[PDB]
Coordinates of C-alpha atoms and ligand atoms in Angstrom, one line a residue:
Chain A
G1 CA 11.3 13.6 26.4
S2 CA 11.5 12.2 22.3
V3 CA 14.9 12.5 22.6
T4 CA 15.4 10.5 25.6
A5 CA 12.7 7.8 24.5
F6 CA 14.7 7.6 21.2
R7 CA 18.0 7.7 23.1
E8 CA 17.4 4.9 25.5
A9 CA 15.4 2.6 22.5
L10 CA 18.5 2.6 20.3
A11 CA 20.7 1.8 23.4
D12 CA 17.9 -1.1 24.2
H13 CA 18.3 -2.3 20.9
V14 CA 22.1 -2.3 19.9
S15 CA 22.6 -4.5 23.4
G16 CA 20.3 -7.1 21.9
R17 CA 22.8 -6.8 18.9
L18 CA 26.3 -6.7 20.8
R19 CA 32.2 -4.7 28.1
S20 CA 28.8 -5.6 29.2
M21 CA 25.9 -6.6 26.2
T22 CA 24.3 -3.9 27.6
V23 CA 24.7 -0.1 26.2
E24 CA 23.8 2.9 27.9
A25 CA 22.9 6.0 25.6
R26 CA 25.6 8.1 27.3
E27 CA 27.7 5.7 25.3
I28 CA 26.6 6.5 21.8
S29 CA 28.9 8.8 20.4
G30 CA 28.0 8.8 16.2
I31 CA 25.6 7.2 14.0
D32 CA 27.3 6.4 10.3
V33 CA 24.7 5.2 7.8
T34 CA 25.6 4.3 3.5
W35 CA 23.0 3.8 1.0
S36 CA 24.8 1.7 -1.5
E37 CA 22.9 1.8 -4.8
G38 CA 22.2 -1.1 -7.2
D39 CA 24.5 -1.9 -10.3
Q40 CA 24.3 -4.3 -12.3
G41 CA 27.0 -4.5 -15.8
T42 CA 28.5 -7.1 -17.6
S43 CA 32.9 -6.9 -18.4
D44 CA 34.0 -6.9 -21.7
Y45 CA 34.5 -10.4 -21.5
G46 CA 31.3 -11.2 -20.9
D47 CA 31.4 -11.8 -17.1
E48 CA 27.7 -10.4 -15.6
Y49 CA 27.6 -8.7 -12.2
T50 CA 24.9 -7.7 -10.2
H51 CA 25.5 -5.5 -6.9
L52 CA 22.1 -5.7 -5.0
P53 CA 21.4 -2.3 -3.1
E54 CA 22.3 -1.9 0.7
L55 CA 21.3 -0.4 3.4
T56 CA 23.5 0.2 6.8
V57 CA 23.4 1.7 10.2
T58 CA 26.3 1.6 12.5
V59 CA 26.2 3.4 16.0
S60 CA 29.8 4.2 17.1
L61 CA 30.3 3.9 21.5
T62 CA 32.9 6.3 23.4
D63 CA 34.6 3.2 24.1
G64 CA 35.1 2.4 19.9
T65 CA 32.6 -0.2 20.0
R66 CA 30.6 -0.3 16.5
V67 CA 27.4 -2.4 16.5
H68 CA 24.7 -2.4 13.5
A69 CA 21.4 -1.6 13.7
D70 CA 18.5 -2.8 12.2
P71 CA 17.4 -0.4 9.3
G72 CA 13.6 -1.5 9.7
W73 CA 13.8 -0.6 13.4
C74 CA 15.9 2.9 12.9
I75 CA 12.8 4.4 10.4
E76 CA 9.8 2.6 12.5
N77 CA 10.9 4.6 15.3
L78 CA 11.5 7.7 13.9
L79 CA 8.0 7.5 11.9
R80 CA 6.0 6.4 15.2
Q81 CA 7.7 9.5 17.2
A82 CA 6.8 11.6 14.0
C83 CA 3.1 10.5 14.9
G84 CA 3.4 10.6 19.0
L85 CA 3.5 7.2 19.0
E86 CA 5.1 4.7 21.3
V87 CA 8.8 4.2 20.8
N88 CA 10.3 0.3 20.5
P89 CA 7.2 -1.2 21.7
Chain B
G1 CA 2.2 21.8 15.6
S2 CA 4.8 18.9 13.6
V3 CA 3.0 16.0 15.2
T4 CA -0.8 17.1 14.3
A5 CA 0.6 17.8 10.8
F6 CA 2.2 14.3 10.2
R7 CA -1.0 12.0 11.7
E8 CA -3.0 14.2 9.5
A9 CA -0.4 13.5 6.5
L10 CA -0.1 9.5 7.6
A11 CA -4.1 9.4 7.5
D12 CA -4.5 11.2 4.3
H13 CA -1.5 8.8 2.8
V14 CA -3.2 5.9 3.8
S15 CA -6.8 6.5 3.4
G16 CA -5.9 6.2 -0.5
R17 CA -4.4 2.8 -0.1
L18 CA -7.1 1.2 1.9
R19 CA -15.0 0.4 7.7
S20 CA -14.3 3.4 4.8
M21 CA -11.9 4.1 2.9
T22 CA -11.1 7.5 5.1
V23 CA -8.9 6.7 8.0
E24 CA -8.7 9.3 10.7
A25 CA -5.4 9.7 12.8
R26 CA -6.7 8.5 15.9
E27 CA -7.3 5.0 14.5
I28 CA -3.6 4.8 14.4
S29 CA -2.1 2.6 16.8
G30 CA 1.0 1.4 15.4
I31 CA 3.9 1.2 12.4
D32 CA 6.0 -1.4 11.1
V33 CA 8.8 -1.6 9.3
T34 CA 11.0 -3.9 7.9
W35 CA 14.1 -3.8 6.1
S36 CA 14.8 -7.4 4.6
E37 CA 18.5 -7.3 2.9
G38 CA 19.3 -8.8 -0.3
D39 CA 20.7 -12.0 -0.8
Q40 CA 22.7 -14.0 -3.6
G41 CA 23.7 -17.6 -3.7
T42 CA 23.5 -21.0 -5.6
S43 CA 22.1 -24.4 -3.7
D44 CA 24.8 -27.5 -4.0
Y45 CA 23.0 -28.6 -6.8
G46 CA 23.5 -25.0 -9.0
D47 CA 20.0 -23.3 -8.5
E48 CA 21.0 -20.0 -8.4
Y49 CA 18.4 -17.5 -6.5
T50 CA 18.2 -13.5 -6.1
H51 CA 16.5 -12.4 -3.4
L52 CA 16.0 -8.4 -4.0
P53 CA 16.4 -6.2 -0.8
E54 CA 12.3 -5.0 0.4
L55 CA 11.5 -1.9 2.6
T56 CA 7.7 -2.3 3.8
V57 CA 6.0 0.3 6.0
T58 CA 3.0 -1.2 7.4
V59 CA 0.5 0.9 9.4
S60 CA -1.8 -0.5 11.8
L61 CA -5.6 0.6 12.9
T62 CA -7.2 0.0 16.3
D63 CA -9.8 -2.1 14.3
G64 CA -7.3 -3.9 13.1
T65 CA -6.8 -3.0 10.0
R66 CA -3.6 -3.2 8.4
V67 CA -2.5 -1.2 5.3
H68 CA 1.1 -0.2 3.9
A69 CA 2.4 3.1 3.2
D70 CA 4.7 4.4 0.4
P71 CA 8.1 4.4 1.9
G72 CA 9.6 7.4 -0.2
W73 CA 6.6 8.9 1.2
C74 CA 7.0 8.1 4.7
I75 CA 11.0 9.2 4.0
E76 CA 9.8 12.2 2.2
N77 CA 7.7 13.9 4.6
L78 CA 10.2 13.2 7.9
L79 CA 12.9 15.1 5.7
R80 CA 10.1 18.3 5.4
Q81 CA 9.6 18.0 8.8
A82 CA 13.4 18.5 9.4
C83 CA 13.5 21.2 7.2
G84 CA 10.6 23.2 8.2
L85 CA 8.6 22.7 4.8
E86 CA 5.0 21.6 4.2
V87 CA 4.8 18.0 4.8
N88 CA 2.3 16.2 2.1
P89 CA 1.9 19.1 -0.2
Chain C
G1 CA 17.4 24.7 17.0
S2 CA 17.3 21.4 15.2
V3 CA 15.4 22.6 11.8
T4 CA 17.9 25.7 11.5
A5 CA 20.6 22.7 12.1
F6 CA 18.8 20.5 9.6
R7 CA 18.2 23.2 6.7
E8 CA 21.8 24.4 7.3
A9 CA 23.1 20.8 6.6
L10 CA 21.4 19.9 3.9
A11 CA 22.3 23.0 2.3
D12 CA 26.0 22.1 2.6
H13 CA 25.2 18.6 1.9
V14 CA 24.0 19.6 -1.6
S15 CA 26.3 22.7 -2.2
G16 CA 28.8 20.2 -3.0
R17 CA 27.2 18.3 -5.7
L18 CA 25.9 20.8 -7.7
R19 CA 23.9 30.3 -10.1
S20 CA 26.3 29.1 -7.8
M21 CA 27.9 25.5 -6.3
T22 CA 26.9 26.7 -3.0
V23 CA 23.4 26.6 -1.8
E24 CA 21.4 28.4 1.0
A25 CA 18.6 27.3 2.8
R26 CA 16.4 29.8 2.1
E27 CA 16.7 28.5 -1.2
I28 CA 15.3 24.8 -0.5
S29 CA 11.7 24.2 -2.2
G30 CA 10.7 20.9 -1.9
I31 CA 12.0 17.5 -1.4
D32 CA 10.5 14.2 -3.0
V33 CA 11.7 10.6 -2.3
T34 CA 10.7 7.8 -4.2
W35 CA 11.4 4.3 -3.2
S36 CA 11.1 1.7 -6.4
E37 CA 10.5 -2.0 -5.3
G38 CA 12.7 -4.5 -6.8
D39 CA 11.1 -7.0 -9.5
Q40 CA 12.2 -9.9 -11.1
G41 CA 10.1 -11.5 -13.7
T42 CA 10.2 -13.4 -17.2
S43 CA 8.6 -12.4 -20.7
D44 CA 6.2 -14.8 -22.4
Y45 CA 9.5 -15.5 -24.9
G46 CA 12.0 -15.8 -22.4
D47 CA 13.8 -12.5 -21.9
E48 CA 14.7 -12.3 -18.1
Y49 CA 14.5 -8.8 -16.3
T50 CA 15.6 -7.7 -13.0
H51 CA 15.3 -3.8 -11.7
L52 CA 16.7 -3.3 -8.8
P53 CA 15.4 -1.5 -6.1
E54 CA 16.0 2.5 -6.0
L55 CA 15.7 4.9 -3.1
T56 CA 16.0 8.4 -4.7
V57 CA 15.9 11.9 -2.6
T58 CA 15.4 14.7 -4.7
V59 CA 15.6 18.7 -3.8
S60 CA 14.4 21.1 -5.4
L61 CA 15.4 25.2 -5.3
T62 CA 13.5 28.1 -5.9
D63 CA 15.1 28.5 -9.3
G64 CA 14.0 25.2 -10.5
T65 CA 17.3 23.7 -9.9
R66 CA 17.0 20.0 -8.7
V67 CA 19.9 18.1 -6.9
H68 CA 20.2 14.4 -5.8
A69 CA 21.0 14.2 -2.0
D70 CA 22.5 11.0 -0.7
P71 CA 19.8 8.7 0.7
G72 CA 22.4 7.3 3.5
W73 CA 23.6 10.8 4.8
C74 CA 19.4 12.0 4.8
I75 CA 18.5 9.0 7.4
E76 CA 21.8 9.3 9.3
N77 CA 21.0 13.1 10.2
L78 CA 17.5 12.1 11.2
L79 CA 19.0 9.5 13.5
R80 CA 21.4 11.9 14.6
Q81 CA 18.7 14.7 15.3
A82 CA 17.0 12.1 16.8
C83 CA 19.2 11.0 19.5
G84 CA 20.3 14.7 20.1
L85 CA 23.5 14.2 18.8
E86 CA 25.5 16.3 16.2
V87 CA 24.3 16.9 12.9
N88 CA 26.5 16.3 9.9
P89 CA 29.7 16.1 12.1
Ligands
LIG1 MG1 27.7 -6.7 0.4
LIG2 MG1 9.0 -10.4 -1.9
LIG3 MG1 17.4 3.1 -12.5

């Protein structure tokens, strides 16, 4: 039940973010998430730099399509399922 | 088993962060998570701005109460359940 | 099935990040995740400070070993399991 619902919810979610604009769950072949830590420094010559942390979720489709998902939506729906709540209301 | 435990753990968690200060699982009606990407820029007039990324988890109760949960606690307990470990020890 | 797979995947993951360099799932006794919000300010004397947000996942082993896991890998594999996809491919 929950895997059906989550897969359909993720497919609905990336359909809005994009072959057709509409994505089906069977097309979902992978998920990649990267967390980039922040960094702040100064070169030996005085140039300051600040790299803000980044969280990126990429969904890969069987046809090679790659589409970003919203990390907040992803975490929200993991928590909803963990609590027995409706996904992607 | 795991949904019971997670719901009770989240209710315990937000009870400490708040009708009574104590929240019950049946009261939990929604969860909202937002991820705000960082941003850095400069206006055309030279004003610099830096917006740090933000991760926010909001739990909604049937009585309209909204209470923030700690994002680290949330992710920790998702991982604990995924590993068969005790939640919210 | 999924708890077996997740536990084995996490053990494989931290084995690469470290008694032996290889970690077994039965050794995994805890997980701790902290989210540190960003902060930006200025002291009353003009010193600026900027603390970037941080997400840290620490796995604890029965022998007291503590090892950091990659937060992106963790979130990725939660999402993979939620979608019925292979973990840690
Ligand atoms: Mg960037
Ligand atoms: Mg803010
Ligand atoms: Mg630091």
